[PDB]
Write a protein that binds this ligand. Structure first.
Ligand SMILES: [Cl-]
Ligand SMILES: [Cl-]
Ligand SMILES: [Cl-]
Ligand SMILES: [Cl-]
Lengths: 253, 253, 246, 246
């Protein structure tokens, strides 16, 4: 029987996903990391936090492959205690809604919304079949402030994320008797790899107070929030949405 | 040069769409009705209200065909003043989220969400190219209370309608300078064709106070609301969402 | 028996309230206008729209006086079909929350929230006692975009308006069986050179001032009966200001 | 120069407040407890968790006394790192809105809304004047699911809590630059007769009573600093009760 809880972090080898994986490992979780390709240096780095880490190749959009991925995780770890739905993408192209291509809408919906929904389904079947439950359990979905704030130049992104908000509410109800805490986390403007030109612009916007807290969010901010929710103290808060955005999404006049 | 405003009502041959069509005709609109299935009898009947009525055979999900449908509507009427996005479907199968099939999710998302988005895009291209704007203009999207209330046995439906909520907010911003009023109407429990068994069960629930107003919604309720929004008096309320549910979606304890 | 529906518009002789009164009169309503002081010129202008108009002196904050006001309206008109809760005030002082004075918080809560709640109570007692219901009935409460958008320099105003939002939801449930449509209307930037530039610069997506007539047309739509099954709905009369955008 | 952070928990002597105080002391906070009524036995027992505990007699509604209470807390502890606005009351009478008394509306608004706003103002003045910031800082306001779910038989309660929701949003903006995390926690049906049957019948999706320790665990999580970038968030501590379901 497992002695550490197991977190499956989709898209966990870079960016926000990696910040989440690091926070969870530090809190005492073992880690199943998925992505289209691995990074062995990152897996090694995560093992340095003192737990077990394994990588599983998965395309989130390829829903026919999800059950096999879940079985691989089960075969390696025995069970799943926390799912973090982090994998996602931005819009393929930004621009006028009038120029939005159905093909690009499809690509993002298939990843962010359809893929996440069915990956979650596959994991939940396994969680509901677990013959023992020794750790707090959770499903934490990383959507976006774009779930609730609209950006007309990228409505495909916004719609895909708003879909997740609705999904999470239903999922919370479905899993309430099983005592699996179901949460949404909405990141705002989180630091990414950037050119000086772009970073200087964002920094001026942030310092100007676009973000009330007047700083970049870090992957570690999202990570600490997620690890907080995964530790079990928020079980009775199932269905809650947390905005990891420095106050960006506060409606202000 | 048209002397009456033109409303394009998708799915306008039956049910809520027909109620909306009747109400708009009574207010003085000409009507362009789309549906996948022909119904000349209903078109004939609508002509009794004194306006022009024309039918356009269209499958909402067939996005590659939308430009041609819009071109046909322009050829018949010269312009479009009001779009009512009413066409849609319920979930193919209701039941446990764990049994939800990707193919059924895709069917409903392709109709309710993808189809509506790209049909709207085709219409909006036409509207923004109009060389005369003599009438109030609007886009009224008929979503559902399921946009904001979850039903775990049909999350595909809820997700599709929540997506529309997000879309409507962005669309309202896109069209604000063009003075096209953009609204969401969320129907609740509206009378449909039903067996005595099912109708009796719903009547008991409605009378018990599931619906605070303790009556069925009628297609004419949704029609009267839409015709009010389409008349121009709500232009400055662009981005508003109207329940049409007898209070069903009021959150109460 | 009355042959025209009766609308009671609080704060109805100036500004948004007067736009609402004008729209309702043009739609065929008789008008009971309240305010702290009359303007007989305005009352005369409203009579030009072809109905009955009467003024009733009332301080919205003086809740002990509300029943008498409602009786006066009933004595004049026989019944009330539409209440428009328009009367209100802005914050006494704007500035840092750290400097907010309890007495100023009290002034605005007593008017916008407490006064409205108990005036509504008085009117509703009368509506539920009516022996005839020949017209569509409604209660339309004019709150603000500040019900849902926060302004830290005037949190007393924001809190007062958010309170009304909660009140309207409850009221809608209370009155649903009686088929009294209950609605919230949230005005944005309604009609200066400073505001012009901000509006032109796109703070308001529609890029224009709201007019009292915008709010009036919306209210008159709701009061006409076609929105009865949409009870509990909120409409924002703000040119898109309150759409959450990034 | 303090070596442990300080949490001021209003109404901390019993119920949810005591569950919050316990969770915070277990996480390493010193405690300033307020209540209108003393209970030295409870204070004594809290010291068993190993931190400093002090009591300050305070009536949340008595806003003229708040600066003195905060001065006393500063005299004892040197600063305040976490404020938990827990103190509050239910409606004096539950019943038809038509029977709601202004006197009762005033009592609850004075405690839950006005008292909380101005007690927070006093604490925030102290926080913003601090010469040292060695610990994560937060203001966690305990409202209710009634902030967003209406109950027509107690609209005074609902309105008071909705007013807090709006307050928290503005407060979060005001304090964001200062990196004080500002949060709302909305308790559902917490164990403090009909209800036990309703919970069984599925009203609460998780099908159990909430405990004061549920709310306490949530608050201690928020107070620990890891949620600083989530300022403005609302957490519903209700077993899924407020999820809008059809
Ligand atoms: Cl994007
Ligand atoms: Cl369905
Ligand atoms: Cl103001
Ligand atoms: Cl209560």
């Amino acid at each position: 029987s497992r002695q550490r809880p197991v977190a499956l972090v989709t898209g966990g080898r870079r960016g926000i996903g990696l910040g989440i994986a690091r926070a969870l490992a530090a809190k005492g979780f073992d880690l199943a990391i998925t992505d289209r390709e691995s990074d062995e240096a990152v897996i090694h780095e995560l093992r340095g936090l003192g737990g077990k880490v394994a990588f599983f190749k998965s395309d989130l959009a390829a829903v026919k492959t999800h059950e096999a991925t879940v079985f691989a995780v089960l075969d390696a770890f025995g069970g799943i205690d926390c799912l973090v739905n982090n994998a996602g993408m931005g819009a393929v192209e930004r621009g006028d809604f009038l120029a939005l291509k159905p093909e690009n809408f499809d690509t993002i919906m298939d990843v962010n919304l359809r893929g996440t929904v069915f990956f979650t389904q596959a994991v939940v079947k396994a969680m509901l079949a677990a013959d023992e439950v020794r750790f707090p359990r959770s499903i934490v979905t990383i959507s976006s402030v774009s779930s609730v704030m609209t950006s007309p130049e990228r409505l495909d992104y916004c719609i895909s994320k708003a879909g997740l908000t609705a999904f999470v509410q239903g999922l919370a109800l479905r899993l309430a008797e099983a005592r699996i805490g179901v949460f949404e986390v909405r990141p705002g403007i989180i630091r990414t790899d950037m050119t000086a030109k772009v970073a200087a612009r964002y920094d001026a916007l942030i310092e100007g107070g676009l973000v009330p807290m007047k700083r970049w969010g870090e992957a570690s901010d999202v990570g600490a929030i997620v690890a907080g929710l995964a530790g079990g103290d928020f079980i009775f808060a199932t269905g809650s949405a947390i905005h990891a955005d420095g106050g960006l999404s506060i409606a202000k006049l």
